[PDB]
Amino acid sequence: NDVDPIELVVFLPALCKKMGVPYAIVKGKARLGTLVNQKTSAVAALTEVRA
C-alpha cells in the first residue's frame, strides 16, 4: 500500500478484478521484502500452494 510511485500498482486491483485473481492491499513493501528476502518487494504472489 506504500509504493512511492503509485502508478506501478494502481492498476493491480483492477487487473486482479478483471482476471478473477484474489488480491489484498497490505501494509508494507518492507514486509513483502522480508517475505522475499529483499528490502522492498511491492508485491507477493502465490500461484501454487502445497496440499
Binding site: 494502481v10 492498476f11 483492477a14 487487473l15 478483471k18
Partner: protein, 99 residues
C-alpha cells in the same frame, strides 16, 4: 496496375514482369496486438475520461455529432483525429447505459 507500355496515359510505363515482394513486418507498426487491446481497455476503465472527452460526450448527447466534431477538431489536431475521437466517444456512449 499493369503498365501500358507507352510513356503517357494512365498506367504509363514499361511492362516488367511483376514479383509482389514478401510483406515487410514494418507496415504493420500499428497492428492489432491483443496485448495492447487488453492493456488499453484496462487503463481506459481505471482512468476515466479526460475533461474534453466528457465535454465531447455531452456534446454528442445534447448538441449533435457535427458540433461534437467541431469541438473535437478544435481540441485535437485535425479533422481525421476529431472524427476518430467522436466515433470512440459514441462507442463509449453505446457501451454505457444505452447498451
Amino acid at each position: 496496375t499493369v503498365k501500358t507500355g507507352i510513356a503517357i496515359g494512365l498506367n504509363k510505363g514499361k511492362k516488367v514482369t511483376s514479383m509482389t515482394p514478401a510483406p515487410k513486418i514494418s507496415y504493420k507498426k500499428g497492428a492489432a496486438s491483443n496485448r495492447t487491446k487488453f492493456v488499453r481497455s484496462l487503463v481506459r476503465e481505471i482512468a476515466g475520461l479526460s475533461p474534453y472527452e466528457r465535454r465531447l460526450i455531452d456534446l454528442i448527447r445534447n448538441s449533435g455529432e457535427k458540433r461534437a466534431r467541431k469541438v473535437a477538431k478544435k481540441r485535437l489536431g485535425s479533422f481525421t483525429r476529431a472524427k476518430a475521437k467522436v466515433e470512440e466517444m459514441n462507442n463509449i456512449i453505446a457501451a454505457s447505459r444505452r447498451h
